[PDB]
Enzyme design. Sequence first.
Site, short mmCIF file in Angstrom:
data_model
loop_
_atom_site.label_atom_id
_atom_site.label_comp_id
_atom_site.label_asym_id
_atom_site.label_seq_id
_atom_site.Cartn_x
_atom_site.Cartn_y
_atom_site.Cartn_z
N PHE A 4 -35.32 78.10 27.93
CA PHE A 4 -36.01 79.41 27.91
C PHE A 4 -35.45 80.47 27.08
CE2 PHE A 4 -36.45 83.70 29.94
CZ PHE A 4 -37.57 83.87 29.58
N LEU A 170 -40.33 78.51 37.27
CA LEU A 170 -41.12 79.69 37.90
C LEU A 170 -40.49 80.86 37.12
CD1 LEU A 170 -43.39 80.69 39.04
CD2 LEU A 170 -42.14 80.40 41.17
N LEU A 411 -27.71 98.61 40.69
CA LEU A 411 -28.00 98.55 42.07
C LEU A 411 -27.94 96.99 42.47
CD1 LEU A 411 -30.55 101.17 42.72
CD2 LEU A 411 -27.90 101.70 42.85
C1 MYA Z 1 -39.27 94.42 27.53
C2 MYA Z 1 -39.29 94.16 29.00
C3 MYA Z 1 -38.30 92.95 29.11
C4 MYA Z 1 -38.37 92.52 30.52
C5 MYA Z 1 -37.75 91.17 31.00
C6 MYA Z 1 -36.11 91.27 30.37
C7 MYA Z 1 -35.40 89.93 30.75
C8 MYA Z 1 -35.16 90.01 32.34
C9 MYA Z 1 -34.21 88.67 32.83
C10 MYA Z 1 -34.05 88.40 34.25
C11 MYA Z 1 -32.87 89.57 34.80
C12 MYA Z 1 -32.55 89.25 36.16
C13 MYA Z 1 -31.43 90.21 36.66
C14 MYA Z 1 -31.12 89.63 38.20
O1 MYA Z 1 -31.94 90.01 38.81
S1 MYA Z 1 -29.89 88.92 38.33
C15 MYA Z 1 -30.07 87.92 40.05
C16 MYA Z 1 -30.63 86.91 39.67
N1 MYA Z 1 -31.16 86.45 41.17
C17 MYA Z 1 -30.36 85.42 41.77
O2 MYA Z 1 -29.22 85.02 41.68
C18 MYA Z 1 -30.87 85.33 43.34
C19 MYA Z 1 -30.86 83.76 43.62
N2 MYA Z 1 -31.41 82.68 42.51
C20 MYA Z 1 -32.57 82.54 42.25
O3 MYA Z 1 -33.39 83.23 42.94
C21 MYA Z 1 -32.82 81.61 41.33
O4 MYA Z 1 -31.81 80.76 41.11
C22 MYA Z 1 -33.50 82.23 40.05
C23 MYA Z 1 -34.30 83.25 39.85
C24 MYA Z 1 -32.00 83.24 39.40
C25 MYA Z 1 -33.57 81.45 38.81
O5 MYA Z 1 -34.55 80.61 39.22
P1 MYA Z 1 -34.32 78.77 39.39
O6 MYA Z 1 -33.00 78.51 39.62
O7 MYA Z 1 -35.29 78.24 40.14
O8 MYA Z 1 -34.61 78.40 37.64
P2 MYA Z 1 -35.93 78.19 36.99
O9 MYA Z 1 -36.13 76.65 36.86
O10 MYA Z 1 -37.11 78.96 37.32
O11 MYA Z 1 -35.47 78.76 35.70
C26 MYA Z 1 -34.43 78.23 34.79
C27 MYA Z 1 -34.09 79.40 33.81
O12 MYA Z 1 -33.52 80.50 34.64
C28 MYA Z 1 -32.49 80.94 33.82
N3 MYA Z 1 -31.76 81.93 34.71
C29 MYA Z 1 -30.90 81.79 35.89
N4 MYA Z 1 -30.38 82.83 36.36
C30 MYA Z 1 -30.94 83.69 35.62
C31 MYA Z 1 -30.76 85.20 35.90
N5 MYA Z 1 -29.66 85.67 36.72
N6 MYA Z 1 -31.19 85.80 34.91
C32 MYA Z 1 -31.93 85.39 33.83
N7 MYA Z 1 -32.04 83.93 33.92
C33 MYA Z 1 -31.68 83.38 34.61
C34 MYA Z 1 -31.72 79.79 33.46
O13 MYA Z 1 -30.68 80.06 32.63
C35 MYA Z 1 -32.78 78.90 33.08
O14 MYA Z 1 -33.02 79.48 31.56
P3 MYA Z 1 -32.51 78.30 30.30
O15 MYA Z 1 -31.14 78.33 30.66
O16 MYA Z 1 -33.10 77.01 30.70
O17 MYA Z 1 -32.81 79.01 29.21
C1 TUT Z 2 -19.42 88.23 49.25
O1 TUT Z 2 -20.83 88.52 49.50
C2 TUT Z 2 -21.45 88.01 48.57
C3 TUT Z 2 -22.98 88.23 48.83
C4 TUT Z 2 -23.85 87.96 47.59
C5 TUT Z 2 -22.95 87.73 46.21
C6 TUT Z 2 -21.97 88.08 46.10
C7 TUT Z 2 -21.21 87.83 44.57
C8 TUT Z 2 -21.77 89.15 43.87
N1 TUT Z 2 -22.84 88.55 43.37
N2 TUT Z 2 -21.39 90.29 43.63
C9 TUT Z 2 -21.87 91.08 43.18
O2 TUT Z 2 -23.01 90.94 42.57
C10 TUT Z 2 -21.05 92.38 42.72
C11 TUT Z 2 -19.72 92.49 43.17
C12 TUT Z 2 -19.18 93.43 42.77
CL1 TUT Z 2 -17.22 93.76 42.95
C13 TUT Z 2 -19.79 94.50 42.44
C14 TUT Z 2 -21.04 94.80 42.13
C15 TUT Z 2 -21.65 93.58 42.26
O3 TUT Z 2 -23.03 93.57 42.28
C16 TUT Z 2 -24.08 94.87 42.54
C17 TUT Z 2 -25.04 94.44 43.37
C18 TUT Z 2 -25.88 93.29 42.99
N3 TUT Z 2 -26.45 93.65 41.83
C19 TUT Z 2 -25.41 93.97 40.55
C20 TUT Z 2 -24.42 94.97 41.12
C21 TUT Z 2 -21.03 88.16 47.22
MG MG Z 3 -38.22 77.55 39.43
#
Ligand code: MYA
Ligand code: TUT
Ligand code: MG
Length: 411
Positions: A4, A170, A411
């Site tokens: 992607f 997704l 945030l």
């Molecule tokens: C102009 C306006 C533009 C607006 C949009 C701007 C862009 C915004 C981008 C988003 C900014 C988000 C900021 C935050 O919220 S960072 C917090 C992200 N959330 C989590 O970590 C929550 C727990 N995990 C999940 O919910 C899932 O594992 C997620 C949703 C993360 C991936 O779902 P899943 O694991 O089921 O996978 P898939 O098969 O659907 O998709 C696989 C693709 O997803 C790529 N992937 C994995 N993690 C991330 C990630 N953190 N940012 C971007 N991409 C990510 C991955 O490299 C692969 O792409 P490729 O490697 O194959 O190429």
């Molecule tokens: C130990 O508890 C947890 C629970 C869930 C995840 C993690 C690891 C983790 N991702 N930390 C952070 O993102 C984070 C860490 C620090 Cl110092 C400062 C900011 C952080 O993020 C804020 C909130 C999430 N949006 C990005 C900014 C640890």
């Molecule tokens: Mg998926």
Amino acid sequence: AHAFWSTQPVPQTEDETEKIVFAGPMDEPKTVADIPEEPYPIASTFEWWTPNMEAADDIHAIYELLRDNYVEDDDSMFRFNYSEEFLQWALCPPNYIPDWHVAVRRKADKKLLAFIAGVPVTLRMGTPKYMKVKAQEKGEGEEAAKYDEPRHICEINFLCVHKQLREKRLAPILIKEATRRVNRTNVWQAVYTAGVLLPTPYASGQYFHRSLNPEKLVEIRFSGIPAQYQKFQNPMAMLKRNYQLPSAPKNSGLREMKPSDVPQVRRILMNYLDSFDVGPVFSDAEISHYLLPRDGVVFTYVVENDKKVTDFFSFYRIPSTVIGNSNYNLLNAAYVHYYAATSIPLHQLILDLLIVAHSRGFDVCNMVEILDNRSFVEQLKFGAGDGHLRYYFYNWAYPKIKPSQVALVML
Ligand SMILES: CCCCCCCCCCCCCC(=O)SCCNC(=O)CCNC(=O)[C@H](O)C(C)(C)COP(=O)(O)OP(=O)(O)OC[C@H]1O[C@@H](n2cnc3c(N)ncnc32)[C@H](O)[C@@H]1OP(=O)(O)O
Ligand SMILES: COc1cccc(CC(=N)NC(=O)c2cc(Cl)ccc2OC2CCNCC2)c1
Ligand SMILES: [Mg+2]
């Protein structure tokens, strides 16, 4: 390697990032009329849904998806549990666009499968100082200055796919439909962070943590008793002592921020954030929204000893669920938000952040090494963690900057 992200308008490698010497778009924008109003295609068993994030029950639905399915630590011991009040605050700032809050639902049982959110941000994202000097040294100041004025863009956060729908591609579909909704409003860049490495950050800051209740932190396995403390007869009493804080703030005239403080807080914050290469511009309304205190969500104090606000700090709260501990259900974490100091040194201001957070039952204070956060780490007993927050732009070429040149708190 990235089916992607190799298709998106972002730098693809560090080698490419190194050649970037001016801020500007990766692809010159089209127009709103180039963007279709038909939503992006989705499987006939799913549907797009736009929650209303000011309506309690839709906030609750997104709150449960994230409680059960949002970010966990690497050993699956803790999971973010952002509150319903935090979510309304984070996603409904002044002039927010409801259509930038995008969910996927399963049609047969109406199960909520995924979410992503955009909000407006006004960002300084023009060429950084060190690259403006290199450009001037070569006669290229005009190219380097072209995008100096603050830009109204999108800040993305809260991407989540339900655990049952992981690894089904997704997330890319949801990101494309969010990009379409943003581009339909004539916005062509976004900013976002992640704790994982993707193509390609323009900055990366290590995590830092400051223990406030080390006995709970070791009980829930966020922390251990370090080796150096095993030499003492009572290692946990010594660890408690190391982290002990005053029970009331030290700065005279510290008080919670009030609506009447918004103009002065705006002025001292905006003057401070100008010193950084990438940072937000906040109107009075946005200072009000992001910094006035809200119970359980955002905590902001000003120093006003002589009828003038001279300094302030803020922190926000995200509790995490503790999976499976018989003593504790939550890890209550405070995150350093914005601050500015004009009359006292920053370590003296942030010591009062730690004292107020500890007094209010917080277990740890977290921050990334952005802003001037490195200037108080050792005296205040923060330690680096084994994680990094990476900063990204969508559709913006940007020279690599150090995290001490980033002023956008996520945030
Ligand atoms: C102009 C306006 C533009 C607006 C949009 C701007 C862009 C915004 C981008 C988003 C900014 C988000 C900021 C935050 O919220 S960072 C917090 C992200 N959330 C989590 O970590 C929550 C727990 N995990 C999940 O919910 C899932 O594992 C997620 C949703 C993360 C991936 O779902 P899943 O694991 O089921 O996978 P898939 O098969 O659907 O998709 C696989 C693709 O997803 C790529 N992937 C994995 N993690 C991330 C990630 N953190 N940012 C971007 N991409 C990510 C991955 O490299 C692969 O792409 P490729 O490697 O194959 O190429
Ligand atoms: C130990 O508890 C947890 C629970 C869930 C995840 C993690 C690891 C983790 N991702 N930390 C952070 O993102 C984070 C860490 C620090 Cl110092 C400062 C900011 C952080 O993020 C804020 C909130 C999430 N949006 C990005 C900014 C640890
Ligand atoms: Mg998926």
